Design a protein around this ligand. Structure first.
Ligand SMILES: O=C(O)c1[nH]c(=O)[nH]c(=O)c1F
Ligand SMILES: O=C(O)c1[nH]c(=O)[nH]c(=O)c1F
Ligand SMILES: [Zn+2]
Ligand SMILES: [Zn+2]
Ligand SMILES: [Zn+2]
Ligand SMILES: [Zn+2]
Lengths: 356, 356
């Protein structure tokens, strides 16, 4: 009755440690990951302190090693001051994040593309015409780029045109941009519904599904904020998503909107090959595709303690997760302690191959 | 000085056992694989008896388990009589091979696409307009197809157009169609130079390199025949290629014709994800990128005992291979016995996931 899947990978999560641990920490965020069928996460660098230099990465690595329950890699963040300074630590990171929603000039983007090691990943938060701009910088520096959370018809059609020209670009799409739209903003409210990229029109959502062939990865963009923060005076953008991503997508699979293989390419194989992430021995996920349930007002594990998918009916649930030979999750209970997770870039097979 | 690569995968080899063991057998073919940096092979079904029914697959599986030195999966072959009969064994195979260079009617192709389990791979030997025809059958049956050894400008541009339309098609290219051309037919002779698909023009070769973005996999199409056979009265088509594929491509990498990552996508990640092949624990390849050498008249291991690349200068050599924790190859010597290799489809992680 159960379907065995490989260990799924979420390449875009915000785990808020250090500095935002009331929103989430490594222990709670990776508990949410395991409950969502995710055995490896790549954690973004916009923490406090931000992971924009070697001392902050060293701190974050130790906090993750001590708190993570699943395996992980940590992104470095591009800043206005660190281009050309990350060479000694660059290989220890998941990749370099460019946040193009602190850099402010395309010249600084160029400097990062020129100085970051050319064999290591660069991901960009780039919306609307910024996608076109960062692709231009990638071409000028003759390297690849990965575009985070594509959310608009405009963006996916541009990427589609770039791929037709043979340019090295890959992209990811988050669940809220496939299963939520403007039609949900009345229910969510302007605080809760705040996210970046913002929710799209029905035409945007329909374009993403129609152009699934162009989407390389799914990633949650897990961006936990407390309900107090989301409903407060200055709502931060972001949705929690680790615990709901796979149930939403399994529903789509059971409805024939994409195949099981389509899903595993986008949550396992393509994340592995874009970010050069290693396999996980003795690691798998067992899901039940027949159980119908309704998403509640908060999932059990994220400290966000709310979800924008409340009330949606899903079909599919994570029943069991085994991580490196140990039972890590069964039916609502996480069973590996904080600290069980490891930094995959420290594994011999987790280093990115490069010419000597 | 050495570069560590993951275990490379060759998804298109002819190992001639059963029935053609003077040309190659599992023990000699997988020795050649290991010497070429290849730790997993998918073996084609045109043996004697051909692998077109359950009894012949059962025989071939035992011969491979007893003779293989690296890991493997075995293809089933589509015939004029076996459509709708392979359901019980289909999951144990690498995939289904359609040989469209014994079926003779597009109606038989349709029957195979309709009856073979829709989650399992289908590969086709399809040249020139046959690529277009089999893509049409794939669309009519709304599933994917993988096109073997693309060799012509015509073929890669057609596939490129199909991918631009979002169709689920992948393809592989063999080394002789990237590094040999019509210009080599004078040296090779009409016997030795016989191969299917035939060698292309310089314009064909140039088109394949220009459209590298369209190529998902490299695979040797290792097709060993003895020199006596290649030079005899009725030369069979085919080149041996396992021992020369990686040295040729490493040369191209050192020349900047493609990157190391480009190579590993095409000899590791994409083969894994198209054929749902499992990772290999404690498995890696160490190559030396600085050693210049000239390809001799025969490589040490293949029973073919000849090579069409004789006299080409290459830069790059396989120094060491570790397979599942054991030293399998060092500097000209294979050190795992026949029988060390295993059928990856029998591993729990090697089954193709499917809906219950
Ligand atoms: O960190 C966050 O909360 C966050 N939330 C968002 O909605 N978009 C972002 O780009 C981001 F960095
Ligand atoms: O098995 C062979 O020898 C062989 N040799 C080739 O050159 N093309 C084929 O398609 C083939 F099946
Ligand atoms: Zn972002
Ligand atoms: Zn983000
Ligand atoms: Zn063929
Ligand atoms: Zn072949």
């Amino acid at each position: 009755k159960l379907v065995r899947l490989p260990g799924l990978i979420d390449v875009h999560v915000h785990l808020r440690e250090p500095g935002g641990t009331h929103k989430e920490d490594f222990a709670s965020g990776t508990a949410a990951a395991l409950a969502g069928g995710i055995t490896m996460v790549c954690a973004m660098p916009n923490t406090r302190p931000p992971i924009i230099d070697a001392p902050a990465l060293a701190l974050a690595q130790k906090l993750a090693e001590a708190g993570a329950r699943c395996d992980f890699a940590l992104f470095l963040g591009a800043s206005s001051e660190n281009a050309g300074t990350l060479g000694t630590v660059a290989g220890s990171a998941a990749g370099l994040k460019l946040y193009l929603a602190g850099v402010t000039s395309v010249v600084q983007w160029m400097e990062h593309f020129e100085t970051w090691p050319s064999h290591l990943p660069i991901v960009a938060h780039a919306e609307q015409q910024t996608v076109a701009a960062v692709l231009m910088v990638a071409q000028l520096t003759q390297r690849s780029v990965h575009i985070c959370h594509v959310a608009r018809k405009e963006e996916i059609l541009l990427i589609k045109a770039a791929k037709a020209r043979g340019l090295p670009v890959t992209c990811e799409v988050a669940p809220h941009h496939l299963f939520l739209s403007h039609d949900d903003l009345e229910r969510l409210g302007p605080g809760k519904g705040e996210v970046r990229p913002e929710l799209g029109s029905r035409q945007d959502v329909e374009a993403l599904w129609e152009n699934m062939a162009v989407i390389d990865c799914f990633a949650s963009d897990h961006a936990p904020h407390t309900l107090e923060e989301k409903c407060g005076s200055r709502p931060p953008p972001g949705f929690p998503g680790l615990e709901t991503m796979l149930p939403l997508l399994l529903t789509a699979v059971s409805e024939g909107r994409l195949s099981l293989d389509d899903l595993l390419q986008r949550l396992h194989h393509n994340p592995r090959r874009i970010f050069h992430l290693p396999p996980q021995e003795d690691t798998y996920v067992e899901v039940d595709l027949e159980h119908e349930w309704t998403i509640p007002s908060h999932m059990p594990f994220s400290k966000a303690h709310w979800t924008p998918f409340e009330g949606q009916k899903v079909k599919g649930t994570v029943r069991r997760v085994v991580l490196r030979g140990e039972v890590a999750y069964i039916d609502g209970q996480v069973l590996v302690p904080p600290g069980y997770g490891q930094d995959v870039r420290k594994w011999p097979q987790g280093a990115v191959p490069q010419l000597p």
